[PDB]
């Protein structure tokens, strides 16, 4: 139960002008850059809604996303995840070399302990035998006994966040996408967003990054989140940010509005007609559900119950960073 | 309790002039969260109905159940059918397959097939089912009994289950190169399965919009009419029709008997679906459609309905043509379609002496 001062602090935090910048630029302030990648984790921390339609039979559908990050080494894709795991009501961090099939699953596995939380897994690529052991837990949203499958099920609600390295160390720029990841068409479709990061030798970016790392030790939705030097964006302490997700996850249930659904319908019908002829990951009906699940997510961060056209216009730009915008 | 029988008699007494409307209403309630897909939702009812066991005097006993297998591209609804059919049936054990060890598929302690006596064992992810384990079920799938002498104990157990399986088409699926090539399964195994329905996703600009509107608008049961049916009523229905014992007839058997003789050698006889195990399934399927419609006398209508479904089951090579399972919708009137199907079937395989009698029966009804 939350104290009175807790409610006062939550109400005060809700009153900020730009509530999205103060959350997307305070999850981890050491890392410089990577705005959309941090926005993805910020969206995934909250989650979506659970649909119990047709209560006679239901067959419920999961209401939380799954994010995978793949890119060149040295970019820093192992500290955006530590902060994400730390800022959570319940989290767990496990490596991908010291854990086996009996470890991730019940034998109480890592997934069970990460109930209603995040179970971020590092070094995803190094796994070669446990790949076919979580396709059931991720989709069915339940896990049964591992002893000959004699019933005895137990709930397992997880929001797996994974990071991995390409097969050939550095990822070269003249191949096909499918052979640089070593993944089938079954495990590459469950995940909601699959960001691909490159490391190129620019000039201004390096000059800013070196200055930032030397100082430490002594409009599209890509510029409105960036900080122009000459202002203060003082971050919320993680102690106070951990007691905001909890209030947001049990006192508001968002739902879509009639205006927002049209944009998603148009985007789905535009993706399908174009990528059914070109070569890419097949667009099943899962993406239409994914857009709904993420547009509901951008209504639990600002503590509202609706989906305006502006909110549905943000899961269109962040979506074009692993799909069409990046497949080229 | 006489109330249940009275209600079901009222239901299958009102629909006397139109007999197929009752079956359509029966099928509409199976997995009502999905749109269309007629043949897939029809085959599951036949599989779940069952059959009748016939044991000879001295030693032998032939099978009396049925099996099914679904193959399709990811994102078509395979898992929903298994999850929904694991609830209607009284006893069911849902397994993961590749996540299940040898202790479950066979005896160890009771596993999964043994533990599901008089039930239905759903199996998922059949593509890489631990080849030893994937082949140690031939004995338990065709003789309904196990026979093991492990560690010098000599133990025999009974296992009578109906198996539902769903596996992905590993490797990009092709219209040619029949499932024995695309899935790469042995011919001995790919013969005990009764119906192998193939699901293929194609280029269309109407089904896309319809399903998009379905998912987005959250329209639960677009047929807003309050007929439907609750799950308890359907459970009672599929636990009550499992007591009737239908008997064969004479306007019946001849159609299947001629169909098998014609199919045995047309020009290709496929490669594995033309054995004697075809006429042992064309009867166990035709004897289930006579138990779903509250009677005990197989007639020409059941034979035609099972022949059409079974002919559409064999993808590619056939004797009329193949129709995709996904792109199908409930007909507005089933009577005219049945009248056309009877005329189409009873012409090229010659029993025209029965067409006149069937037309006379239909006119006077
Ligand atoms: N933008 C950045 N600002 C400061 N340090 C960075 C940045 N990007 C990467 N680093 C440095 O990289 C290291 C993280 O390595 P990382 O890329 O996570 O290894 P891996 O590629 O094996 O995941 C940290 O010690 C951090 O100091
Ligand atoms: N006709 C439909 N109506 C609504 N949802 C559908 C339909 N067909 C497929 N789906 C969606 O597709 C998913 C089924 O996935 P499925 O193809 O069974 O996975 P797998 O490929 O592992 O078998 C369900 O979550 C469901 O929401
Ligand atoms: Mg790391
Ligand atoms: Mg499945």
From Swiss-Prot, chain A:
Q: Which residues of the full protein are shown?
A: 384 to 753 of 840
Q: What is this protein called?
A: DNA helicase MCM8
Name the linked condition.
Answer: Premature ovarian failure 10: An ovarian disorder defined as the cessation of ovarian function under the age of 40 years. It is characterized by oligomenorrhea or amenorrhea, in the presence of elevated levels of serum gonadotropins and low estradiol.
Localization recorded for this chain is: Nucleus; Chromosome
**Protein's gene:** MCM8
Q: How does it assemble?
A: Component of the MCM8-MCM9 complex, which forms a hexamer composed of MCM8 and MCM9. Interacts with the DNA mismatch repair (MMR) complex composed at least of MSH2, MSH3, MSH6, PMS1 and MLH1. Interacts with RAD51; the interaction recruits RAD51 to DNA damage sites. Interacts with the MRN complex composed of MRE11, RAD50 and NBN/NBS1. Interacts with CDC6 and ORC2. Interacts with HROB; the interaction recruits the MCM8-MCM9 complex to DNA damage sites.
Stretches assigned to the MCM domain: 19-213
Which positions are annotated as binding ATP? 71-78
Q: Tissue expression, per UniProt?
A: Highest levels in placenta, lung and pancreas. Low levels in skeletal muscle and kidney. Expressed in various tumors with highest levels in colon and lung cancers.
Reported function: Component of the MCM8-MCM9 complex, a complex involved in the repair of double-stranded DNA breaks (DBSs) and DNA interstrand cross-links (ICLs) by homologous recombination (HR). Required for DNA resection by the MRE11-RAD50-NBN/NBS1 (MRN) complex by recruiting the MRN complex to the repair site and by promoting the complex nuclease activity. Probably by regulating the localization of the MNR complex, indirectly regulates the recruitment of downstream effector RAD51 to DNA damage sites including DBSs and ICLs. The MCM8-MCM9 complex is dispensable for DNA replication and S phase progression.
What is this protein's expression induced by?
Answer: By E2F1.
Give the family this protein belongs to, as stated in its UniProt record. Answer: Belongs to the MCM family.
Q: Show the taxonomic lineage.
A: Eukaryota, Metazoa, Chordata, Craniata, Vertebrata
UniProtKB/Swiss-Prot annotation, chain B:
Cite the binding residues for ATP. 72-79
GO BP? DNA damage response; double-strand break repair via homologous recombination; female gamete generation; mismatch repair involved in maintenance of fidelity involved in DNA-dependent DNA replication; protein localization to chromatin; recombinational interstrand cross-link repair
The record's Gene Ontology cellular component field reads:
chromosome; MCM complex; MCM8-MCM9 complex; nucleus
- Could you list this entry's UniProt keywords, alphabetically sorted: ATP-binding, Chromosome, DNA damage, DNA repair, DNA-binding, Helicase, Hydrolase, Nucleotide-binding, Nucleus, Phosphoprotein
Q: What is its main location?
A: nucleus
- Main function: Component of the MCM8-MCM9 complex, a complex involved in the repair of double-stranded DNA breaks (DBSs) and DNA interstrand cross-links (ICLs) by homologous recombination (HR). Required for DNA resection by the MRE11-RAD50-NBN/NBS1 (MRN) complex by recruiting the MRN complex to the repair site and by promoting the complex nuclease activity. Probably by regulating the localization of the MRN complex, indirectly regulates the recruitment of downstream effector RAD51 to DNA damage sites including DBSs and ICLs.
Assembly, in brief, is: Component of the MCM8-MCM9 complex, which forms a hexamer composed of MCM8 and MCM9. Interacts with the DNA mismatch repair (MMR) complex composed at least of MSH2, MSH3, MSH6, PMS1 and MLH1. Interacts with MLH1; the interaction recruits MLH1 to chromatin. Interacts with MSH2; the interaction recruits MCM9 to chromatin. Interacts with MSH6. Interacts with the MRN complex composed of MRE11, RAD50 and NBN/NBS1; the interaction recruits the MRN complex to DNA damage sites. Interacts with RAD51; the interaction recruits RAD51 to DNA damage sites.
> What name has this protein been given in UniProt?
DNA helicase MCM9
Q: Which organism is it from?
A: Homo sapiens (Human)
């Amino acid at each position: 139960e939350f104290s009175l001062k807790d409610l006062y602090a939550i109400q005060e935090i809700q009153a900020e002008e730009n509530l999205f910048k103060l959350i997307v630029n305070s999850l981890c302030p050491v890392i410089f850059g990577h705005e959309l990648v941090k926005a993805g984790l910020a969206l995934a921390l909250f989650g979506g809604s659970q649909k119990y339609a047709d209560d006679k039979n239901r067959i419920p559908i999961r209401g939380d996303p799954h994010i995978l990050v793949v890119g060149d080494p040295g970019l820093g894709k192992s500290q955006m995840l530590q902060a994400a795991c730390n800022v959570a009501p319940r989290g767990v961090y496990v490596c991908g070399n010291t854990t086996t099939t009996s470890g991730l699953t019940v034998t109480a596995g890592a997934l069970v302990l990460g109930d209603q939380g995040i179970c971020g897994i590092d070094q995803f690529d190094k796994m070669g035998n446990q790949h076919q052991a979580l396709l059931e837990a991720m989709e069915q949203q339940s896990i049964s006994l591992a002893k000959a499958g004699v019933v005895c099920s137990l709930p397992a609600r997880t929001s797996i966040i994974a990071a991995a390295n390409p097969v050939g160390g550095h990822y070269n720029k003249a191949k096909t996408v499918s052979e640089n990841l070593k993944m089938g068409s079954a495990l590459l479709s469950r995940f909601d967003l699959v960001f691909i990061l490159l490391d190129t030798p620019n000039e201004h970016h390096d000059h800013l990054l070196s200055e930032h790392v030397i100082a430490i030790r002594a409009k599209p939705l890509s510029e409105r989140l960036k900080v122009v030097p000459g202002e203060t964006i003082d971050p919320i302490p993680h102690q106070l940010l951990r007691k905001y997700i909890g209030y947001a996850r049990q006192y508001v249930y968002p739902r879509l509005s009639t205006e927002a659904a049209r944009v998603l319908q148009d985007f789905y019908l535009e993706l399908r007609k174009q990528s059914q002829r070109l070569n890419s990951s097949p667009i099943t009906t899962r993406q239409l559900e994914s857009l709904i699940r993420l547009t509901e997510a951008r209504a639990r961060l600002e503590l509202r119950e609706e989906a305006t056209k502006e909110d549905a216009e943000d899961i269109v730009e962040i979506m074009k960073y692993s799909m069409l915008g990046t497949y080229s | 309790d006489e109330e249940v029988q009275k209600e079901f008699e009222d239901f299958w007494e009102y629909y006397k002039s139109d007999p197929f409307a009752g079956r359509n209403v029966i099928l509409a309630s199976l997995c009502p969260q999905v749109f269309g897909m007629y043949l897939v939702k029809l085959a599951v009812a036949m599989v779940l109905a069952g059959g009748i066991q016939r044991t000879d005097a001295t030693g032998t006993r032939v099978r009396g159940e049925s099996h099914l297998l679904l193959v399709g591209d990811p994102g078509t609804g395979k898992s929903q059918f298994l999850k929904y059919a694991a609830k209607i049936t009284p006893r069911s054990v849902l397994t993961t397959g590749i996540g299940s060890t040898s202790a479950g598929l066979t005896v160890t302690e009771a596993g999964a097939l043994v533990l599901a006596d008089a039930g239905l064992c759903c199996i998922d992810q059949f593509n890489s089912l631990k080849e030893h384990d994937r082949t140690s079920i031939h004995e338990a799938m065709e003789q309904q009994t196990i026979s093991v002498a492990k560690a010098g104990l000599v133990c025999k157990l009974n296992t009578r289950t109906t198996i539902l399986a769903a596996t992905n088409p590993k490797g990009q699926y092709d219209p040619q190169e029949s499932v024995s090539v695309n899935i790469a399964l042995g011919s001995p195994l790919l013969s005990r399965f009764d119906l192998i329905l193939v699901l293929l996703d194609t280029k269309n600009e109407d089904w896309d919009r319809i399903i998009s509107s379905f998912i987005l608008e959250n329209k639960g049961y677009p047929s807003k009419s309050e007929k439907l049916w609750s799950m308890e009523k359907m459970k009672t229905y599929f636990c009550l029709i499992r007591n009737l014992q239908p008997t064969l007839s004479d306007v019946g058997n001849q159609v299947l008997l001629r169909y098998y003789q014609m199919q045995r050698q047309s020009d290709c006889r496929n490669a594995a679906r033309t054995t004697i195990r075809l006429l042992e399934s064309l009867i166990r399927l035709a004897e289930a459609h006579a138990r779903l419609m509250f009677r005990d006398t197989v007639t020409l209508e059941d034979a035609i309905t099972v022949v059409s479904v079974m002919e559409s089951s064999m993808q590619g090579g056939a004797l009329l043509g193949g129709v995709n399972a996904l792109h199908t919708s409930f007909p507005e009137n089933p009577g005219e379609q049945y009248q056309r199907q009877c005329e189409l079937i009873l012409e090229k395989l010659e029993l025209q002496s029965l067409l006149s009698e069937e037309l006379r029966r239909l006119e006077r009804l």
